[PDB]
Design a protein around this ligand. Structure first.
Ligand code: HEM
Ligand SMILES: CC1(C)[C@@H]2CC[C@@]1(C)C(=O)C2
Length: 394
């Protein structure tokens, strides 16, 4: 059944054959399907024989510990079946000049203007497919604004990024990546010569280790800033809007109590956490009584820390007034999402603008929403409807 044979250092009593790309109970919702790993008969660290064979840490304490311990759990192979500290700190520091908290605070209303334009387009229609019509266009338009790229390039960039996460067969993953680099290289070179204040100019003019960043370093940094802020945001906004379409009392709460929108964002980030990446052991290492071997891959699912009942009570319920929202949805440790501040502002702006203009909306009649699981889990489609006479062209 596609199972890799058990390595001889792994005890049989820790084997649980969870498949991160096709978990059993996916029609209950992806977070629910993954929470099978937190049932009380499942140890805190298990081995699955799926996807080549790899460990899974199932509890927040272990997932945080491993992400803290970059000496033993390296990001050189984070994907199942890429840099660690000090170089990594140099590149982060450079990325932070593009998406750090000061930039996001200066840029917050550009983000709100984009949301309002998209939302006002859709509002009189009384229907949309949220994933396609808002969740994808909003982060890609923010990228083009931040990167100083023109509107007419959106469809071709969206296309290249779609081929990495869901190829239609036109391009290999390698061709998609090279096509993207081919697009970015000449703009990086131009803006090294004639910089502006956009993101690509900031990157193209950084220094690594006492010298000008190379073309190769800059294309990879630009590429990671672009792909990092797309599938995660698209899918997270869709999980959150799926929940709000199904829960009118939570819509009402935020309409009545808009000051709670930033806390609601944090709680949605906990409940609809969606990333599950990995590390590779750099050496043999005993971790909580379990012998790990050099070279073993371990999935450390950021999704699971906040769903762990040990971290949050009644973790499947959405409660915007939780006193302490514990999660690792943007990661933990040295690779903690550089985009965490930009993403929170995109979530808060989308909650404020959507519930202002379209306060009452539902899942389309008859639609059954379907999820997909993987390194970034997500929503296949989100058909929504509403009565235009209940909307506000504010
Ligand atoms: C809700 C939206 C987002 C979520 C849940 C998310 C989550 C994550 C997580 C879990 C990681 C760490 C992965 C690991 O340690 O293996 C990460 C890293 C990263 N994210 Fe995000 N992210 C989101 C939005 C964004 C945005 C808007 C950007 C902006 C470009 C972005 C850029 C990055 C980058 C560049 C890294 C790599 C950091 C490094 O390796 O040092 N993210 N993100
Ligand atoms: C979560 C990320 C943004 C980070 C870089 C690309 C991404 C989608 C990953 O799977 C690791």
């Amino acid at each position: 059944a596609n199972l890799a044979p058990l390595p001889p250092h792994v005890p049989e009593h820790l084997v649980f054959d969870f498949d991160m790309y096709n978990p059993s109970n996916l029609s209950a919702g992806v977070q629910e399907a993954w929470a099978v790993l937190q049932e009380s008969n499942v140890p805190d660290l298990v081995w699955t024989r799926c996807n080549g064979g790899h460990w899974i840490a199932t509890r927040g304490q272990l997932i945080r510990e491993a992400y803290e311990d970059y000496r033993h759990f390296s990001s050189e192979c984070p994907f199942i079946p890429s840099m660690d500290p000090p170089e990594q700190r140099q590149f982060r520091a450079l990325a932070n000049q593009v998406v750090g908290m000061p930039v996001v605070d200066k840029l917050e209303n550009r983000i709100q203007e984009l949301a309002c334009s998209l939302i006002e387009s859709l509002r009189p229609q009384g229907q949309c497919n949220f994933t396609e019509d808002y969740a994808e266009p909003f982060p890609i338009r923010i990228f083009m604004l931040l990167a100083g790229l023109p509107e007419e390039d959106i469809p071709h960039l969206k296309y290249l990024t779609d081929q990495m996460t869901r190829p239609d067969g036109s391009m290999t993953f390698a061709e998609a990546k090279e096509a993207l680099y081919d697009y970015l290289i000449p703009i990086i070179e131009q803006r090294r010569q004639k910089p502006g204040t956009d993101a690509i100019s900031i990157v193209a003019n950084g220094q690594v280790n006492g010298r000008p960043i190379t073309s190769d370093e800059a294309k990879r940094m630009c590429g990671l800033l672009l792909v990092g802020g797309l599938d995660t945001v698209v899918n997270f906004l869709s999980f959150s809007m799926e929940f709000l379409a199904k829960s009118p009392e939570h819509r009402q709460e935020l309409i009545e109590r808009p000051e709670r929108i930033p806390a609601a964002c944090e709680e949605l980030l906990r409940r609809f956490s969606l990333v599950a990446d990995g590390r590779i052991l750099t050496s043999d290492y005993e971790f909580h009584g379990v012998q790990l071997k050099k070279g073993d891959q371990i999935l450390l699912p950021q999704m699971l820390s906040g769903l762990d009942e040990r971290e949050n009570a009644a973790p499947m319920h959405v409660d915007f007034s939780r006193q302490k929202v514990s999660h690792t949805t943007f990661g933990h440790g040295s690779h903690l999402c550089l985009g965490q501040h930009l993403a929170r502002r995109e979530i808060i702006v989308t909650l404020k603008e959507w519930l202002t203009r379209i306060p009452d909306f539902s899942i389309a009649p008859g639609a059954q929403i379907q999820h997909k699981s993987g390194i970034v889990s997500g929503v296949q489609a989100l058909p929504l409807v509403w009565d235009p006479a209940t909307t506000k062209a504010v």
